[PDB]
Design a protein around this ligand. Structure first.
Ligand code: FAD
Length: 295
């Protein structure tokens, strides 16, 4: 049932950019773009929580053709316009140090994508991934722990759950469980999809909780910048109590480095009831209820 590898890098789907729109507001750190691609003319189908590959143009420093980079699909299966014709990505421009004055390095594929024009043709592969799939059970609980562009799979879940047009398009999935997004970004301008996440919470105050960790605007109890692991620690007992439910699924997505703190917080919660979290978590992973995609 799950679509996988309908296109492969030896013969990718050539899609066209429909739109490329900024998600970081003025005063935010960095560049994150919402990029929508036209899928008409091919048969690329996908579901929520999957990824696609993008093959950037050009050669690397060794004169070899650039390989695909993976990006989490940011739209539901129907695409943003609920027409089954498009796919969207949430792409941050990678840029970093190499310790010289002004000398910034820009990532190949992410710079290509964040600056791409509508009408441009792009090499797309996939979809891939079966580790971040959403349960069909409408009564499932869904905990979402995201930093930065790790919001992307979370958006596909929340849009399927809560967008009016999605609910109209998916008679079989009328979500009535509880979902909780804890979302970590450096600033309020950097809150990707802020308006829509908050509109969802206002519509569905009993089915959706939104928690932010904004590092440059908030401090944890120890005086440090507020990160997602601090919010998990702050709510560790509630999160553990939700996780004990047989129908609760947890999803963790974003750049690597978040998991150690999340585990330490949940380990302290579970230990209060004589449970060793690492063991409970192993069984949760085996059961398909602990989902991680960090990069
Ligand atoms: C499953 C999956 C899903 C992903 N989803 C998304 C998504 O939704 N959105 C998104 O923006 N990205 C996503 N990523 C990451 C994405 O695939 C690319 O790795 C990223 O966009 C950078 O690619 P690039 O071509 O821009 O960089 P490259 O040009 O390959 O640059 C990256 C290389 O430079 C180095 N480098 C990177 N950062 C630093 C640093 N701080 N200091 C020193 N050296 C460094 C490393 O050698 C790294 O291999 C995902 C990755 C995976 C594996």
């Amino acid at each position: 049932d799950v679509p996988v590898n309908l296109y492969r890098p030896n013969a990718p789907f050539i899609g066209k950019v429909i739109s490329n729109e900024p998600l970081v507001k003025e005063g935010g750190i960095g560049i994150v773009q919402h990029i929508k691609f036209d899928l008409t003319g091919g048969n690329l189908k996908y579901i929520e929580g999957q990824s696609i590959g993008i093959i950037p143009p050009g050669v690397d420093k060794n004169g070899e053709p650039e390989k695909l980079r993976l990006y989490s699909i940011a739209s539901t299966r129907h695409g943003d316009d609920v027409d089954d014709k498009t796919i969207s990505l949430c792409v941050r421009q990678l840029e970093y140090k190499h310790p010289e004055s002004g000398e910034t390095v820009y990532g190949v594929c992410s710079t290509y994508l964040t600056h791409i024009e509508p009408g441009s043709e792009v090499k797309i592969t996939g979809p891939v991934g079966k580790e971040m799939l959403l349960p069909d059970d409408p009564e499932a609980n869904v905990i979402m722990l995201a930093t930065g562009t790790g919001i992307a799979p979370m958006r596909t879940y929340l849009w399927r759950m809560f967008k009016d047009a999605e609910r109209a398009a998916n008679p079989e999935y009328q979500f009535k469980g509880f979902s909780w997004l804890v979302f970590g970004v450096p600033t309020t301008p950097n809150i990707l999809y802020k308006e829509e996440l908050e509109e969802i919470q206002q519509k569905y105050p009993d089915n959706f909780r939104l928690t932010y960790a904004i590092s440059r605007e908030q401090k944890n109890p120890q005086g440090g910048r507020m990160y997602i692991q601090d919010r998990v620690a702050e709510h560790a007992d509630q999160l553990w109590q939700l996780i004990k439910n047989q129908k609760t699924h947890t999803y963790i997505c974003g750049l690597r480095g978040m998991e150690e703190g999340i585990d330490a917080a949940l380990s302290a919660a579970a230990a209060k009831e004589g449970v060793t979290w690492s063991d409970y978590q192993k069984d949760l992973k085996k059961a398909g209820r602990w989902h991680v995609e960090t990069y």
